[model samples]
Target chain A: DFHVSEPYTLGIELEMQVINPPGYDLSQDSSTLIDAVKPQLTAGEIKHDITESMLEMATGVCRDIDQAAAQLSAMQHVILQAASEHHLGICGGGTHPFQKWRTLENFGYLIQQATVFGQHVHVGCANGDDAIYLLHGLSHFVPHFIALSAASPYMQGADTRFACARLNIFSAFPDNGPMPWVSNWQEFAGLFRRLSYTTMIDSIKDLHWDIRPSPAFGTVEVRVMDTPLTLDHAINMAGLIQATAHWLLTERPFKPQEQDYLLYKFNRFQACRYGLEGVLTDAYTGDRRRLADDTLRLLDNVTPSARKLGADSAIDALRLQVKKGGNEAQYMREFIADGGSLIGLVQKHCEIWA
Target chain B: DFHVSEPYTLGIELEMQVINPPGYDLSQDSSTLIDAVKPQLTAGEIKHDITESMLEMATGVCRDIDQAAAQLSAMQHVILQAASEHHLGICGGGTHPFQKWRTLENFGYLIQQATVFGQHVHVGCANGDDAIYLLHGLSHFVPHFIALSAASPYMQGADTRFACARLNIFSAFPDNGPMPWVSNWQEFAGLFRRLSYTTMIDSIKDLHWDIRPSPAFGTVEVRVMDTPLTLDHAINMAGLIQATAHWLLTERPFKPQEQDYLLYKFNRFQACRYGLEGVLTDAYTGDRRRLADDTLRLLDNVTPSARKLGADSAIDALRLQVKKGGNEAQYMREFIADGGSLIGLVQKHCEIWA
Candidate 1:
């Protein structure tokens, strides 16, 4: 018995790091940034994130591309201004350049070091049934989101070679992986109830599946994308997500099967390790395809959905991103190759925020 | 179409480190150790391992518990003498105290500060069909092997909370972890064939499942155990493996279901993280059980087979290991806690080798 909402409506939450202007490292002053931007925010809200060194900006429910873009742009402007005033900078990369922790109570040592940021995109569902349907449908495309928004190439003062080190670090958690396919909302509830009785999961939120149903919001939240450096790319990624969800809801193009999870994990690893440069296997057909090439092919398929949802321009922006070399991580790598230091990269990125 | 030999026959391959006598750290003297021990070995053989700092000692097919023990003892004695002569020490443990690789060929720039050593035990199977049957049947108990032989607690000048860091280090390889169940040899062959077609895997050797059918040896190799510090413990673990193989082959107590893989991975992680102190889940019944307690319970069931194979004393040694506080890693921690330096601990171990 879940409330059904209008299909394809979007909600986005962007988590970003507050960095010191001098050192360009994580700054423990997210409260100041949040307080400074709190008064001016209207369409979206700014708040403190999990870590004291990070902040989150979440937009209200948006029905179209323009509304979501306007909301995000407005929030970004205010945050940038506040950050500049405080002589601090905000970064939206997957991970920080150098951050270490002394201890973590019960969580392992790795969790303490993982100061990551992400862009969570949520698409409205009609009901529990619709949410579960879209959850299963959206699971396959999570890798595309990761490939598009892989922004963390540097971590702990070195190029990690991995396109998205955040996902790799986050995967250390027990329940942080793909979820099993549920038949409907009732089945999902049953599964959740069973998991609750065990120590494996305490609540539905504890089940950090790459794509999970947010029943409270009547949305299927996609918690895969790394927080891209710019709001433009973030909005485009959100637009593509909305359009993709609309396509899934309208055409019912692909039915998710259990066997898909194997390839799902495979494709996810490919995206995380190689960005768009890797080749992924089609577990169903046993055909191999270049991820970037396949993504371009997929963009062609989702164009009609983008057009229907008035997100065609957003989708086009993504296409342009693919055409112009690669994602944010690749560009970051290029910057490093061209005599750019980690501190210099962040400093230049801060100037963009200014 | 594969040959299977008599069940319960044993073979073990132990990976050991060559350490500098003075510094008591990993020394690149595997070739020297191999050359020194080559002439005196008959029923056993020694060779250079994957890295220059390590060596591998392999025993011929062992029918009885005594044969395996004697072969290991003879090889250990000869290797120790050779190590002493070359100003090096042969130490057996999961990982070196302070060793790490900077870069690997295929896996670029990994934090592989790990020189992990393992004792791979193989028990003969009647044929390919029998091997596959035992492979599936024995897969559930791989975690127990890891717990009993957990030896890599200390790594890179720190006490990593993990009981067995070697397994974690080795898991970074492309084809590591538990495998799926196949009904018979044909099904397994088909699976292997399909995987071979993909670039991910090259041959059966590339399928580094914790327990795998070694078609070339006509046995199912259990490669989960860290190389125990003493040859006595290694022989005892081998005896337990032989006896357990006999028990599974005779009683056929458990049939591996598809759902077992989930719990297999879960239990494996527990053993890696907490040694014998971790709790594991029963996939079929949804029941939770402490791995150490369950392992002791399994020992009770396999006691009859142990007696038949004359390995009851060996299994009893494992019980004593648990009762006496912990595995090799715990002993190392205790040594450190008692005001012992890392170098001093290695020096004392070098005396053991002497």
Candidate 2:
């Protein structure tokens, strides 16, 4: 029977950066961490995340947000412990605070996949069309949520201007980068169908268009939010997603503001480039709002779903992250306070839990 | 340097038929021919015929007719000789004269690729758009070719009304049947891109359209031919295809033929029901013609390519088949002469080479 009537899903996807040790770049030595832990990971226990240089820990579909968060945490611990043994610390901060992709050669040669960058976490949904409808509406607001989710404020040791600096690098793909708000589910499905007909993207999985609906599994795949570096962060991210998707099932349609298409497009670009700094127009009245403020509001609304699903614990953990300020703002303050030395910034990653 | 210069291929695909012994119901025992031949079949010698049950071989680049024919023949012989040992008779007619498809079992369930019923082969050309285009296009016309190539006049000692019964069962799947020919390459590519965007068809390789052009390999795929059961028959058929493709490539831009589309579609259906008796319209002028007449012209035109490619031996072998009036025709004539006993047909297969 079609579960469109029930329209609920509990899914989690965690993205983690692939990193080199304190002394080495991401060479074969850094790969050893994943290699050593390979034998234990299985489809049932934990599914290994595959990407260029990033490692992801994906939990199976859980019954609720709480269950999803726990599954992800278990996977995270396995990866973290394995990482420590090799002395390869999981790079937590987005873009390593000051690290540049050009200077860093820390990716893999995935001969199999076409767009050989970014990390992915796929979630299966019960009511695919409804889930896609929600995702289509939410993609406009999701990027700022990413700014709040921002962790890569410092890379190596310097400051990256963008709040979610990881996004700058992740958006290099031409076909990817962001999702445009569509008119409705039919239009969304039509876009997917048209893409399937025109481009080389044929499979439902190949829709890598970030934040799209999956007709095959009856789910919507969320491709925003940077990969989580720690277990707690990954759980929190998944928790928010599970709740957000659940709400969309019963909620009214997410109507786009009367903002002009050009303005919205431009603002979306700003969201990709500047993260939480610029003013993004409100989705209802086309009024401007600070990126950070809008993000917190969205989180507050979705937090209850997390509470109902018992994912509040993870959300609470992430809430502390918001209060502490995003990686960009905090890392910049650290840089100014520490006389521009990246070592203190690096040390901060080791101490932070969420 | 980026070979994106002259547009390259988008994808590739290959298709193979499920086959079984004559005079018996179809079952797993049908594909037992693969197990009987692996030892002697060298990979390089027959690079294209790499698979087990059905033989749909391919290469990254276009090959000379002689070379392609030789490799195909070598593979066919290896498989046939092996089948002969087990008293399994094999012959490829566009449609088998009388085999009932309801009794036929697809090889994947009996073998490894059970998911989607040999979908991997359809998905394998996940290489480039052109590869996918050619495969998808060719995959569509398989049944039509089976109808025209219907050599089987007798199956299990039954006198079937249909000329190519093999096609009748295959035609039942509308999803993988016939294609719409584009006015030009751009129109062709447009359809592919749109389908990809929509997610109706997954990948270019998975595209099951009937007539697709290969921008990468610079050829038009004509899947309107049945897989021959004998080595010489397969080679001769390949020789004709090489020549036909070469002509189309060198010829002027083709004006879209409206009638050809309807005729081709109708012909596929007809071919399924009546092998050599299937009606065919002239591909260029739309004149209705006997399938045999159309085939003769194709063979004549391709003779030059065969000669240029040093396929004299292969061509000579094919000529001998005509002298013999084809294995299927001979098979039926003798079956009726001997009071219609299937054992007599089985005995003929014992020393078919003799």
Candidate 3:
């Protein structure tokens, strides 16, 4: 039996896109920008997240989801302000507004951390079984998480069917791996201990965990979401993490969804390969939901908790997101409208971000 | 006689040292500092001179000692603010307080414009007979000029004995020069036009004008000064230029001692070679004055011009420079006190600037 504690705590991480309103491949500008903001860090709210290009933000510990949502939202504002001053835009959704590989420079901590692209946010959950359970539930929904956050759909002047081509591109990395099934906290810790000593594997951090415990930080880390392009999306994703974790801790106990996990693995591929039009397997029944419905239902299930946490408004605000279309859908639409002008999408991202 | 309507103006260029503190090197603390101060530049005052580890400030046009003194003081304030933000310090004397070749990395410039070293400040004045006569008169007291601005006495971690080691060090570089002599305005302009390749040499805006004429900036350029380590020394030198210019323009036109021009060359050597200890030859009668006496006399001459330009404070402030012992003197003092620790000096420099 997994011993769990109550009154769950939460922390947030934001992996955001830094777009150049003028153009792409703004690695130098991003580097210069990080230097520019050092003097203004009065409260120490911002930090170097590893990449010279992307800035990561974190929050003080929170007692409930509502507090977590507010803290993360505040952090997002701070990022926007800093990014704006540098003439760079910070937004979240899987994929870039449009991909411009010719101008894309491998940014962030390239030499030290490698992977030459994309950003990530690692949300923190409580200790003990609470952490394990939250992470456990989150593993299977990894594809759904990436899809909801998918912002990059257009690349090099063409509509990539996936909502976020960034996720697709990201998944293509040689170091990418799948998170293994762990029954509980003990199992998870044991697996990591074994993996770390694996002489055959290069680096253990490459093992992607949709939600997993970070021994160093003493919290469960979520790694399923796509890089959000806008501050709002980034904040909402944080909110979702907060609400979901609170629910997981409260519900307690679970029926293992081993078969559902297989569906998630397949759905994860379909989402990146087909985006908004792709079908996603139900987290419980292995039934399929239209990509958009899956997104809506995910929102609905979290609303009561969101309302309880006072983040109902934020969840409701997701409607505006849907109406505007996700970053992938928009990029796809723009690509089709521009007669396959990849340059147009790239130009638009640059213009909007810069 | 030097011709009136001279083609060039007068200007000064100085190279500065980015030290860690008063007497430290291997400035470990300052390695990524320039990188740290990256984000707040947008709201700060616009300055062409503030970059990386050094702050470059300039004085406005000066027709007399008074104007030079005032402009110099203004530049001091501007630089001080910037230097202090990063916990860095500034010194205006001729050489580094203590700098070693082994530990120092050659400064790299994004643009080729700053290919050379030593802090360079371009002092503007009118080109022509007035400019030539002023420079000639000041040349008579060249030793005093070196003594007053003597900044670098230490090289690497030991006493190099050269008054302004930066000049000696700079002279070591292969591309030191290929400068045109300015005997008259017509010859200078005609030469410039005939050469037609002015851009390749330097800008009329702030070229090492021996008193180059900057018809474009409507000012004469003065370009003969070594890097000053302390901010106050920079102001003192500025005051001296204004007072000297005022005296030459208004204190009756007298034929400059031709002997002084030859002496001026020797003074440059002494200033760069022996610093405050070297004897200087007067441009006018070939008579020599003690370096200290010469410095005081130059200061005295510039007092009236400074007052005329409402630069009385500038004149008063020039006196404070002596108390500071200039950059060269400070280097000597710090070396003796710290047992020749260049790293310590660098650390101190950074502390002051910070």
Candidate 4:
């Protein structure tokens, strides 16, 4: 059994894009670039990701929000410098816009899919059962994570009219969208045991979900966010999630329900298509509200928890974020609408990522 | 309370692609073309599909295989003549190859998606509860349907390496996979009642699945096959499904188990990627077998039922189909490999369709 060594701890992982200059398409030297920067890294972990054009960074288990930020900031500096030394551009967002799919090689399609990126946050639970509870609760806030971190509005060189097109890219892969609903740890293992027979799934890592319990880490991972354009934005999203998890585990206000998944798919689509402007249906009462309004209300409710966790400022930044009425998705759209070429948008993406 | 006026009857719908000759791209005159063919003395129904480039035809409820074939043949003749008169090329496959995406206007992507064609077969069930049971049973034969009707290996001017890439195109559209597992009509209504709140779903037609209960028609629709090139292929598929349903509902050999769906997605991807060559897992025994082998065995088992339903010849055609060791997907690849341009493939598709 996987045990939570330190309960209520935090960790974050960001999958970042590495691109070359001028054309600003996916660069094949991400493996080399990450290796170049590994010696300079201090607090977090950096490794080559699914493809040659992606770098994955994971933070050491942090005690608080500030530590998470510090680890990310330090890693960012090293990566940026290394990118500069190599004459490569490090951009962050959901997808590498303007890259033609046929230009890539699983391959032609799998490599085309490599152009997309996302973030995952791990909230350490008290136990496996608690992780399931936390996963179910966190699933309710998927729209929040998705809306706040949406950064891919353009893909394949045009406005896809989606806040985050990256989520759709992985649908062809097996086991996407929602995790199989389980009430407790027993059912989790039971379900896992049942699926263990298929060759397609040998272990837990084969399971892909919007939110899933990470038994090996003793945490539940919220996995619905596009890698935002800025490290600050990413940190803030993580803090908001940490505080929400804190509120969920400490207060235990919302009980986990199997029926909660009824609208799970629809809300995810809303978050992907419209970001914060998307409407959300209340899982139980069937009440309707705009995602931004619900997100703001969620922030207000989680304030005491954020205060306890020293994340009030992070919550404030997010409040201002929602109040501004735009996520990074809209910013990328404006970048193009103002006559910036998609390549220029990537250039701007690299600048802001630093 | 949808009443099946005639149990064990069959109906089928085919979404066909309408493209222009020479250039052989999606033609937007599908709306005009359907209206032209409506008065040409048809036994079946033809209508404009989701986008202007799609033509959908549905057969009348048939008592036997010959009637379904006759209905499809008559409709095919009229549609072919109409297509010739309009100077348009009619092709049947999952997607239109070589059509540039930006040329379309939901449009740019939705129209790109509209070029995909599928054949959905409806099995008339005795009651709502029986429909649910039949739906679950039919879920087992998805790979069978997909492997036999495998087509559309080429898409967006490239070999996508998928026997039916059309499945992936619709993944972005909500509810394009398996229906929610429910044992009875009560649970079906219960699910309908729950999801009914979201604006995305006010009715059953809004619910898209690889297989679903058609409450309006009192049938369960098997929705995983590509629109094959010829009327004979389409009718043969319908016959196989009709015969399988007869075997399932009459003998009640395999009891529906929720655990059977554990391998559903993996098996689907296998069939989509490898067609007849895909491997399938036996839900209970965990024994693996090639899809073609299992499909041939299935035909053998269902032969007695097919004989009673007057579908023995249809099963015979499919037996020869599996024995040939290739589906339409391989044929498309061979055509392109033999130096046929994607345009010429569509021309050949039109010729085969007539």
Candidate 5:
């Protein structure tokens, strides 16, 4: 039931939106941009996302923060160059500012239309057993991850009052949201087999769990982040995920807490709605604490793991984000409140060099 | 655990689309039509559906096919008159021929965008215990229900090769599909409590199962039908559901079968994709039979209940539906093949006499 791999190797898949700069609206230009930069891309593989207005860049396996950051930057640089040459622009956020996503044919007309961007981080595991352990243990930190990376605020030209409206839309799919915890690789394999035989899922990829084990990669993929607007923040997010996996594996193994599963949905919605400002309720004590406070405490706890991985600087950057009073969503709102146009925001996003 | 009710009582909720005749596209005319019919709609309630382009008409509690048909006719007559005065048309189908349902504020901006029409039937149950019994017992006939009432073939101007494309779109919702079976009212209540406590569902209404128990109405609601093109067909569908429920409770009391739940989803999809011509796989033996053959057998089995309820005429009408070589969707395809425009289809539907 277990597969082998190097522990703590990092991989990331960032979904980004392609925009036409004239009005900063979504452009069906992903195909063109991929074609233009396909030959130049060397850091990772470029792939098509759900819609033509989006692109996904998956990084190669990396042992440390330096490699992940360099690979992401190289991929970003090539994409940006190609976008500029084609009069297209790229932005990183949970959703497009003004454009609406339309349903396409491939999904069997299951959806009307929606556009959302996400950052998926894959932290390598030693085996399937390690992956399953990490999947359960790392879930405690999912809200913290969401709070740190909440990047969607505006949708359809209006403020939705949600820190990350993308999750609200994403959760509408039948197989999305948190998964039930399994005790070990044997349990996970059995569960997968049962679901497969029941016609509940076609493949493991159909699970769409917020945190899922990728047996092929021997990693636990964390899919809670919105695409961070800046490359530095993206790398920082990946670094924290990698370090957290390391901490969960070597420092703190899985603790049998049944209450954690019960509180999972509430905590997830709170993170999506209020970002860091939301309050999380303790299942046992019925006590509430600010999501920001919990996140900060988590950051302190994971600091040792970050230091071991040479990623303390990245953790420090996240601390700075909290000090600044919000994630990217807050900054975008502030920009809009100051009379900044959506086009201006897109323009700034397109001009980020790293 | 159970509530008292008159056996075989009938109620129906019909979701209809508002359309502009000029281009035969969906129109945001729900408010105007409601305003026009507010004075005349005394037999039922008229309300807005998910979008401005749709309206919902709910019939008052009914005891027989005649009463249900009369109430629906009165409501339909008023709506048709209002639609004609406003230079609009009303059609009964699962989806609009060409217009895409756009996301709106009412659904909390969560859904991408999907517009579908359905006819929901309610059959009386004696108690919650009996309701659970019917919920399980009636599930075996869902594929027959779908196949007989399959009315959607065209979606966004294309024939999707599915008898009821509406179910495909509807199943995309987190709660839309067949529900699990519970042996009794206590188990059902406990299940509901757990789901509510976990915040998996906010309200009983949030559970969009294909067949669900409405404790308030003391009925088992069948929500698998596309809105029939004619009021006669609509009443006939309701008659079938009422008769089937009566047959289940009185003729063949609740019998526990574990494998029914396993094959429920596959059979539902077959009915949607192939209508009456689709094949159904027997859960225990894994043997296949034509859906139409099974449906005809079911019709014969439920004939005694229909005759007892004075719905034999309605059952005969359904038999005619099968003898004609198709359901509503096939007739629609035949219309198109015969050079009838979508506008012509809408025009005929708008002019349907009570």
Candidate 6:
């Protein structure tokens, strides 16, 4: 049986880009910084990511957003100090603005070339069944997360005209898209056993579902978010995720069905194309609205749950963000329109990390 | 209930590009050419595809290879004469060597920009359940068809290195992958009813599966082939499809289960990336082989079925093709390697279509 040490706990992991200055391109010199920063890290752990140009920082379980934020900042602080010593720049974006063509198979050059960052949030479930329930419930919020965390506007010396081109690159891999529909624990196990027979996979980790149950972590991990430009935004998305899970568990509003996923790729494309302005369609009722509108309404609906979890400010910050014409893609374009060069913007992001 | 006029019948649809010469690019003048050709057409019909640049020619239910070949050639011949009079070049290839972007959603510009040509082969079945059976059985050959008909090696004025980039363009839409797994007529009906309730969809035609059950025609339409460069080659592909279906229905091969599909996309990508030489992995047995080898083996295995349908030449031609390196993508790059200009190669397609 999958065991949860504590229900409704939180863990956040970020895959960050390590950049070298003077040119503002990616630096594959993370080893020097990692070696120095590993000793300074306390609450969270800093480790190697897929490529040497990337770094992974993951937190242990935390009670709420505040505790998570403080721990995250401390890790960020230590990493920055070590990075400053090494003259390296740490940054976040769904994609690096200017990387080149890269791979053939495996999490090799292409995954390395994809060079995107994402913030994955894990919310502990009471049991394995609840984890499955939460996974389905969060499927409804996939577009919400995509739009809110839309940051990879520019890639490879041209505007890709996508809010998150990072996700597009991910599609090149075989295991892109959502997890299969399963009701209870036995169904999940049966699915796993059959997949394991091929030896194409060893565990659930190899399967690239948008939301996956990390049996070891005993949580429903929502992995659709682009590692936002600001750490606060990342935390806010996690808060919303937690509160959304809380609401789904408390209210059991509507049962999820296979049909709920019919509009998934469509809605996801809209969000990846237009961000907060993307269209949101209710596959259940066929109703359509703005992602921004749905996101605002989501904040309203989850406020009670948010208060219960003591993360009201996270909800408030998000509402304020939506009202700010809430888009990081918009931010990216203006950085250029304001006479800043693409590389200049890259250089500007070096500070955003610290 | 789906009603097949005759079992073991065939229908072929090709969305051919109308190229305006001197510049050698897609012409928005297919309407003019199609209008003139419609009067001369008899065996099959040529109609408007999604865009003005594409002409969709579809044959009626054909009893065998000779019938589809004759009807298909007649349609191509009439369209070519009309195009010649209009000073246009009629062509085939998965995608135009050079095309520009342009879409705001629906089957508008991006679909238009994708400007791809595909040969969709519909193999008739006796009933809806049979159609479902054939649909699942044919899923195994998706990569086989992709590699055999791999033609789109160029896109947007560059060597894309992808054998068939046309399918990649279709991926921009929501329904870009294989059809969902279903067992019987009732299960297929259950899937349809839930999809229709969304009003987001109307019928089976709205889906973009690699292979889908065409209920109105009572057939399994294999939609993965890049419209091959030659009419003879196209007919050979249809012949193989018919023979394959016969073998499937005559011998209820290993029953297809959902797990059989876990490697579907993976195998499909390998075909797209490498064409005939691509790797093929059997999800059921976890055995690996080259697509060309498997393709050769298929010919040896299906000769009995092919002779039953009088497509012996089709089998001979395919075996001849396999030994000749059997990849259309190789033909494309070699044309350039032999000192042909991109425009000159596209110019060559005018005669190929004729």
Which one wins on DockQ?
4
| Candidate 6, pairs of clashing residues | none
Which pairs of residues collide in candidate 5?
A: B2-B127, B2-B128, B3-B126, B3-B127
- Residue A111 error, candidate 4, Å: 4.2
Model 3 chain A poorest 10 in a row by lDDT: A102-111
What is candidate 2's TM-score against the reference? Answer: 0.43
Question: For this target, which candidate reaches the highest lDDT against the unseen true structure?
Answer: 4
Tell me the native contact fraction for each prediction: 0.05, 0.00, 0.00, 0.43, 0.03, 0.21
lDDT of 5 by residue, B95-142 (tens): 776676423332333454457889999988776787877888788888
Give per-residue CA lDDT, model 1, range B225-299, as digits (tens).
988888888888998888888888898987767656655655777778787887777764668888788888878
Ranking by TM-score: 4, 1, 6, 5, 2, 3
Who is ahead in lDDT, 2 or 4?
Answer: 4
Cα lDDT tens digits for candidate 6, A236-336: 88899989989988888768777678778878888888878787776656677988989988889999999999889999988998988876777988999
**Model 5 lDDT, full chain set:** 0.78
Q: Which portions of model 2 miss their true places by more than 4 Å?
A: A1-6, A22-24, A29-31, A42-52, A96-124, A154-158, A170-172, A180-189, A253-262, A272-275, A283-285, A314-324, A327-329, A332-336, A343-354, B1-354
How do the candidates score on chain B by TM-score? 0.95, 0.61, 0.66, 0.95, 0.94, 0.96
TM-scores for every predicted model: 0.93, 0.43, 0.42, 0.95, 0.78, 0.85
Of candidates 2 and 1, the better by DockQ: 1
* Candidate 6: fraction of native contacts reproduced: 0.21
Q: Assess candidate 6 and give its TM-score to the true structure.
A: 0.85
Q: Candidate 3 — what's its lDDT? A: 0.49
Q: After superposition, how far is residue A308 of candidate 4 from its true place, in Å?
A: 1.4
DockQ ranking, best first:
4, 1, 6, 5, 2, 3
lDDT of 5 at B193: 62
